[PDB]
Nucleic acid binder design. Structure first.
Length: 214
RNA sequence: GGGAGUGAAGGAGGCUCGCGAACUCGCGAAGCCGAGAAACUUCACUCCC
């Protein structure tokens, strides 16, 4: 529908931006319409998987023991084993960094009551509260699912931002990445696809390219 | 599409200066903020003319 639009909208931002000493990632910003941001009414705190995903696999880490914690290493992930949970809670500088380094966290479920009490504080209101993992479960259907998961939270404000690619991936690829990010929209109450004002996209060190066609 | 502040998004970078007949090409132990939410690029909400 407005595919051609957003498509031109992004061809415009690839050169509308400077080369860099690393690679820029694409972000889409959205300006809402009529709501109140004050009602339980959807605030979008959901997460919906990205089709072609990013160019950068999300980063995961796990809190657990032995077997659960075993899936980790061979899976290439980083891991925080029990005792270190304390050792960390009394060393916040590191505690933090870790958090700014890993998109997601999964916990040996029965291990939350050590987490909340020890990693908790400097973790939760930073979006890093780790998700529980039942007893002895299989991780890949989720973890593997996550390397491409993208978050869509906004707290109480009529706007939002999400990643939807990386300078390395391709034009069209992003589109749908976005398109898809939008289906989130339609499902609520009655928010067709147009309950927002404008929409720009641009990457890390580039210009917020405008919303329309030509 | 002048500036303030606050918020949230991407982020490991960003930016100056010197020498060669040399714009962003080469050479430079030359310097300045940053990977601590706070550098850099932004968007929006309340301002200020």
């Amino acid at each position: 529908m407005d595919r051609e639009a957003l498509l031109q909208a992004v061809k415009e931002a690839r050169e509308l931006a400077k080369p860099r000493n690393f690679t820029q990632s694409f972000e889409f910003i959205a300006t809402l319409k009529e709501i109140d941001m004050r009602k339980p009414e959807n605030r979008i705190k959901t997460e919906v998987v990205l089709p072609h995903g990013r160019g950068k696999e999300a980063k995961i880490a796990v809190i657990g023991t032995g077997d659960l914690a075993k899936q980790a290493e061979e899976l290439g992930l980083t891991v925080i084993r029990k005792e270190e949970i304390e050792e960390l809670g009394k060393n916040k500088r590191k505690l933090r960094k870790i958090a700014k380094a890993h998109d997601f966290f999964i916990a040996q479920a029965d291990l939350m009551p050590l987490i909340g009490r020890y990693m908790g504080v400097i973790l939760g209101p930073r979006g890093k509260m780790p998700k529980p993992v039942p007893a002895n479960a299989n991780i890949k259907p989720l973890v593997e699912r996550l390397k491409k998961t993208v978050v869509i939270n906004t707290r109480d404000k009529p706007y939002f931002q999400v990643l939807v690619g990386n300078e390395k991936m391709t034009d069209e690829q992003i589109v749908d990445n976005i398109e898809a990010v939008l289906n989130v929209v339609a499902k609520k109450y009655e928010k067709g696809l147009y309950h927002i004002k404008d929409a720009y996209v641009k990457l890390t060190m580039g210009p917020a390219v405008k919303v329309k066609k030509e």
